Amino acid sequence: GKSKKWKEILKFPHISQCEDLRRTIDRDYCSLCDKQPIGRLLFRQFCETRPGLECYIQFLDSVAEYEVTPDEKLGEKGKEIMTKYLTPKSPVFIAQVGQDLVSQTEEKLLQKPCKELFSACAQSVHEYLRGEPFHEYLDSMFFDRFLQWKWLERQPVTKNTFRQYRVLGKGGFGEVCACQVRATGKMYACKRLEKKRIKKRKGESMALNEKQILEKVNSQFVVNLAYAYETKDALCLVLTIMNGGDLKFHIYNMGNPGFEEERALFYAAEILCGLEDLHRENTVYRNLKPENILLDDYGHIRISDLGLAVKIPEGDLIRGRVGTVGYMAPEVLNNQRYGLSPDYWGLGCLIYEMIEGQSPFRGRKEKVKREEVDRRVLETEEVYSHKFSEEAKSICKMLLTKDAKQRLGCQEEGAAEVKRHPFFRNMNFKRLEAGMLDPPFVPDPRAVYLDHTDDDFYSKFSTGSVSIPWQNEMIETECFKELNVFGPNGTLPPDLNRNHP
Ligand SMILES: Nc1ncnc2c1ncn2[C@@H]1O[C@H](COP(=O)(O)OP(=O)(O)OP(=O)(O)O)[C@@H](O)[C@H]1O
Ligand SMILES: [Mg+2]
């Protein structure tokens, strides 16, 4: 439900207003033609204009198809790409790949198909497009149009930018509205943080830390920040909305308690991919527990509640002793200096609890004081049942290795070590990362499953819209599709023409 007036509020500014942006935007190929959703479409749209560029995009498109293709049909899709782009006769023959590079891929398929067959040629294409095609696209009307989208992105976010609907919960610092953008109609979830609740607690530092972690992560498996605006009586964090309920609910109230191993595997796989993205920024999450893994409407999961997460300077350790009783890694309970390893401890606790329907150190039916829980965590070896394949016992007791020095993924290799583990022997992370795999359970839609130091913090926190999620909102809500229109027969529309404003 877009507002009746949306075409105006999202009206492109005239190109003449974007001059500041033009000189300040850093002209990085990978950012402007790929990381930024709308710049990606604008560049691809620029390549369709000239013919002989268009085959390079058609190629990269099919490589992406081939990299997820079911392993049974991998080489079958390879042959098709070979007879379309890697053969001199074909009309969409890509020449900047070189007759060398293709002759090598020709025997790569004769030497059995792997997902990285065409990865060679693809880089050859990206190395070319970064060159001449990019700098034409910059001095073209499609980057002028990209600047207009950026102009709208940087526009100021206020309470009137949204519609705050039913409240889905209550939080430590405030309630969690279910807000909608007026112009686009996209649904999000507000995290309302009452003012004085921060002021009395001196929680500014941990509030700003959360906002900053949230906006620096672009992951499918971690809640994303789309907006950070301040109001007269709160500070809002607009995030990904997740209505599928949380994992705790599905482990216990929907479960046996517990999942089939194959069901738990899917969840683990995504949680693992989620942790990998946090760990690219060398950020540690530390709050892994079932009730913090949320499900969306399609049935996929994301990691929620990052208020306990901190960036770690590369090659430096942190100290904490924070978390939840029974989901705290040994090194945390001992208040030792640690790195990212607590998060693989948490993976072990999440895979165990999903298969067995209870914590690896606390019976679902057990009364135990906090002390004995921790004692077990540090001293007792957990037990497994016939609910666990050999493969699943293995991964868990490796992730639940007391000594974080011999714990999975805690070596230089990292999460790559964990994906290889035989528990994911049947999991295809490329297709998972691509959404090709169907979640095991799909949730039914209609279900319930006062000074200047503050003025400083306020403005540091209230930075506005986040770039990547805001451009995705435009595309998703077909606001890009409708508004991104040019002139009849490839001519300058009036908003991109300097001759008449
Ligand atoms: N991404 C989201 N989408 C929809 N609702 C969400 C989302 N994230 C959190 N919530 C809701 O927020 C409510 C709980 O609030 P919140 O997590 O902020 O603090 P809490 O419940 O007091 O405990 P804690 O923060 O320590 O986990 C729940 O009702 C949950 O459904
Ligand atoms: Mg919270």
* Residue 239 CB–ligand 1 contact under 6 Å: yes
Q: Whole-angstrom Cα distance, residue 398 to residue 414?
A: 13
8 A C-beta contact, residue 221 and residue 303: yes
Phi, psi of 235 (to 5 degrees): -125, 125
Distances (CA, A) of 212 to 63, 153, 199, 283: 34, 18, 19, 11
Q: In this structure, which amino acid lies at residue 459? A: S
Last-in-domain residue among 401, 417, 433: 433
**Are 180 and 296 members of one domain?**
no
Domain membership flag for residue 23:
yes
Q: Which of 165, 166, 176 gets mutated to test ligand 1 (max ligand atoms within 8 A of its CB)?
A: 176
Residue among 35, 51, 33 at smallest CA distance from 135: 33
Q: Is 176 in the pocket of ligand 1 (CB under 6 A)?
A: yes
Residue 220 Cβ inside 6 Å of ligand 1? The answer reads no
Hey, what amino acid is at 308? L
Has residue 439 been placed in a domain?
Answer: no
| Same structural domain, 124 and 273 | no
**Cα 10 from chain centroid (whole Å):** 26
The resolution of the experimental structure, rounded to one decimal in Å, is 2.8
Q: Is 338 helix (H, G, I), strand (E, B) or coil?
A: strand
**Which residue, by CA, sits nearest to atom 16 of ligand 1?**
171
Short-list 167, 165, 195, CA closest to 182: 165
Query: Is 428 among the domain residues?
Result: yes
CB of 172 closer than 6 A to ligand 1?
yes
Q: What CATH number does the domain containing 166 carry?
A: 3.30.200.20
Residues 252 and 239 in one domain: no
From ligand 1's centre to the CA of 83, what distance in Å? 52
251 and 315 in a single domain? The answer is yes
Tell me, yes or no, whether 232 and 258 share the same domain.
Answer: no
Technique employed here was X-ray
What's phi and psi for 188, nearest 5 deg?
A: -130, -165
> What would the DSSP string read from start to end of 16-60?
GGGHHHHHHS---HHIIIIISHHHHHHHHHHHHHSHHHHHHHHHH
Closest CA to 46 of 137, 127, 135: 137
Q: Token pair of 89, please?
A: 């006769």
Q: Is the CB of 305 under 6 A from ligand 1?
A: yes
Establish if 119 belongs to a structural domain.
yes
Tell me: do 194 and 343 sit in the same domain: no
270 and 257 part of one domain: yes
Q: Which atom of ligand 1 is nearest to the CA of 246?
A: 31
Domain edge (last residue) among 433, 451, 469:
433
277 and 215 inside one domain: no
Q: Is residue 452 part of a domain?
A: no
Residue 101 belongs to a domain with what CATH number?
1.10.167.10
- Same domain for 412 and 486? no
What is the residue with the minimal CA distance to atom 23 of ligand 1? 171
Give 321 Cα–ligand 2 centroid separation in angstroms: 19
Q: Identify whether the C-beta of residue 274 lies closer than 8 Å to the C-beta of residue 500.
A: no
Reading the block at residue 53, the tokens are: 């560029």
- Number of structural domains in the chain: 3
Question: Is 241 near ligand 1, meaning CB less than 6 Å away?
Answer: yes
Residue finishing a domain among 243, 277, 301 = 243
Domain extent for 390: 247-433
Residue 464 lies in a domain: no
Is 167 found in the same domain as 125?
no
Q: How far is CA 104 from CA 64, 128, 267, 302, in A?
A: 19, 19, 39, 40
| Ligand 1 atom at shortest distance from the alpha carbon of 307 | 25
> Breaks in the chain, named by the residue before each, with C–N above 2.5 Å?
449
Domain at 315, CATH number: 1.10.510.10
Asked whether residue 444 is domain-assigned, the answer is no
- Sequence-ordered list of residues with C-beta below 8 angstroms from that of 177, at least 6 positions apart, any chain: 164, 165, 166, 167, 168, 189, 190, 192
The reply to whether 438 falls in a domain is no
Q: How far from each other are the two terminal CA atoms of the chain, in whole angstroms?
A: 31
| Whether the CB of 395 sits within 6 Å of ligand 1 | no
Q: Do 251 and 286 lie in a common domain?
A: yes
Residue count of the chain, please give it: 501
Atom of ligand 1 nearest to the CA of 191: 18
Residues 267 and 415 in one domain: yes
| Ligand number, closest to the Cα atom of 223 | 1
